[PDB]
Amino acid sequence: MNSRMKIKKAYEYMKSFHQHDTTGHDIAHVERVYNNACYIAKRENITDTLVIELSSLLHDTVYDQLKQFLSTLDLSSEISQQVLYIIKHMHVKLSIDGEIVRDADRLDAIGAIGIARTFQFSGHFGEPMWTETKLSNEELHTSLVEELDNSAIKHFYEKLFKLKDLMHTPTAKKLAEERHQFMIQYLKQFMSEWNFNKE
Amino acid sequence: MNSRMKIKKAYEYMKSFHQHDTTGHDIAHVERVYNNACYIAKRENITDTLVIELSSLLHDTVDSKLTDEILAYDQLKQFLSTLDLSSEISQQVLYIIKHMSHVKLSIDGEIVRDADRLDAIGAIGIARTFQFSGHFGEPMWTETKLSNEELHTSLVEELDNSAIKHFYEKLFKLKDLMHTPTAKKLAEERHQFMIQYLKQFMSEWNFNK
Ligand SMILES: [Zn+2]
Ligand SMILES: [Zn+2]
Numbered sequence: 001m002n003s004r005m006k007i008k009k010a011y012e013y014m015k016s017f018h019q020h021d022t023t024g025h026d027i028a029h030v031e032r033v034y035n036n037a038c039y040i041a042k043r044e045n046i047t048d049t050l051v052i053e054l055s056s057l058l059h060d061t062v063y064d065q066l067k068q069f070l071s072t073l074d075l076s077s078e079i080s081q082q083v084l085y086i087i088k089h090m091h092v093k094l095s096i097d098g099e100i101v102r103d104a105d106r107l108d109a110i111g112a113i114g115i116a117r118t119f120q121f122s123g124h125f126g127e128p129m130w131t132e133t134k135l136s137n138e139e140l141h142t143s144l145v146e147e148l149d150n151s152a153i154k155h156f157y158e159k160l161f162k163l164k165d166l167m168h169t170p171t172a173k174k175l176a177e178e179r180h181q182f183m184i185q186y187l188k189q190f191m192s193e194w195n196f197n198k199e
Numbered sequence: 200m201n202s203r204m205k206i207k208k209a210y211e212y213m214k215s216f217h218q219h220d221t222t223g224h225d226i227a228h229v230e231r232v233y234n235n236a237c238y239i240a241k242r243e244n245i246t247d248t249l250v251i252e253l254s255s256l257l258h259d260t261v262d263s264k265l266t267d268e269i270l271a272y273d274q275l276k277q278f279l280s281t282l283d284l285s286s287e288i289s290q291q292v293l294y295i296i297k298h299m300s301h302v303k304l305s306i307d308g309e310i311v312r313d314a315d316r317l318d319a320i321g322a323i324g325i326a327r328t329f330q331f332s333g334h335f336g337e338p339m340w341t342e343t344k345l346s347n348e349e350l351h352t353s354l355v356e357e358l359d360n361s362a363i364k365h366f367y368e369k370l371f372k373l374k375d376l377m378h379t380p381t382a383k384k385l386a387e388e389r390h391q392f393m394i395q396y397l398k399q400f401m402s403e404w405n406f407n408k
Contacts, residue, residue, distance in 0.1 A: 019266070020374070022335065022341075023337065023338040023343065024338050024341060025338045025339070027339070028342075028404075029334035032403070032404070032406065034407055035405065035407040035408060036406060038407060039406070039407040106404075110246070110262055111398035111399065111403050112396055112399040112402075113335075113339075113400065113403045113404065115329075116327075116329045116362065116400065117339070118329075118337045119325075119326050119327075119330045119333065120329050120330065120333030120339060120362070121333060122330055122333065123286075123329065123330025123331055123332065123333030123334040124333035124334060126221060126222050126334070127221040127222070128222050128227070129224065129227075129327070129330065130226060131223065131321075137382055146358045152326065179403070182399055186322060186325075188323065189322040189392055190322040190323065190326065192322075193231070193318075193321050193322055193323045193389070194227075194231070194233060194323070195237065196231065196234055196238070197234040197237060197238040198231075198234050199228070
């Protein structure tokens with residue numbers, strides 16, 4: 001079988017693994033990471049993208065069962081072990097293939113989607129959208145943010161705003177800047193409403 | 200005590216009413232409705248804002264999640280009796296509260312209703328919508344072929360529950376329901392913000408699709 005058929009099989013395996021997810025969230029997430037990774041790969045001029053595509057599609061299915069499935073794709077040990085290593089370490093440095101899967105995954109954590117995911121989690125945990133703090137806005141970008149009670153907005157300062165600068169590839173950095181800029185815009189709009197006519 | 204002192208006590212009563220809210224949303228929500236209502240009232244040139252201020256602060260005090268409407272009203276009426284309000288004022292406030300928990304209201308009631316509605320849209324509406332979906336365990340969006348225009352129809356009721364679905368089924372219809380010019384202006388900006396958020400959201404959702 002060729003690479004195309006193998007990727008197709010990995011795609012099928014992934015959907016089957018998450019078939020019992022009555023939200024489709026898991027599958028959608030994997031698909032976005034996969035599509036982001038493919039966009040980055042081409043942009044970074046990567047000839048063979050088998051490792052990247054397999055890693056992206058299967059990174060969330062975890063290794064006995066994974067090794068079993070991979071054992072049916074007729075892959076060499078070098079490639080097989082390559083994918084497993086990436087999935088396992090997806091802190092150590094990785095090959096460009098691994099750093100691209102990382103970038104694709106990181107990108108899904110920011111932007112309109114990252115914001116949406118963040119608020120969903122807060123709602124799931126019954127956390128507030130935001131809380132009043134005595135810390136200055138500037139201090140929120142430092143470790144002092146850990147002193148805040150959990151809130152969706154806290155997560156913007158503690159994690160989301162730091163992801164763009166962590167992108168590895170130039171293409172991922174570019175995509176990240178757009179989504180980063182958007183999150184700032186959302187925050188400013190959020191605060192304008194939160195403090196509307198408040199004084 | 201004077202008018203703003205009675206308002207202060209209504210504010211204190213509201214914070215006590217929602218004291219058990221562990222999410223902190225309830226109190227913050229009322230403060231924003233109050234602040235929006237005061238903004239609209241000044242811009243609409245409402246002279247006496249007593250009814251608007253008291254009503255906005257107490258607009259949801261007859262909906263106790265822990266108890267019931269019977270005990271809630273009893274407490275509310277008891278609290279209002281301590282403010283030494285005139286018959287008309289008291290009646291006006293209670294009337295707004297009742298129709299706050301399709302009938303037309305006075306300008307004062309419409310302003311409170313406008314302020315309340317505003318808090319359902321914009322960045323805040325986006326946030327609460329996603330939080331609710333998280334609480335209900337629903338996805339942020341579902342796979343569908345229906346176009347934007349189509350989703351703005353009663354056909355949206357065919358999609359499975361999701362956060363984005365709530366944008367078309369409710370959020371996007373609120374701006375047109377604003378009564379006062381000032382609230383219509385504020386809504387236009389919050390409404391356009393939601394449109395832009397949806398566009399960005401979909402651009403990421405279908406990225407390199
Ligand atoms: Zn992932
Ligand atoms: Zn309300």
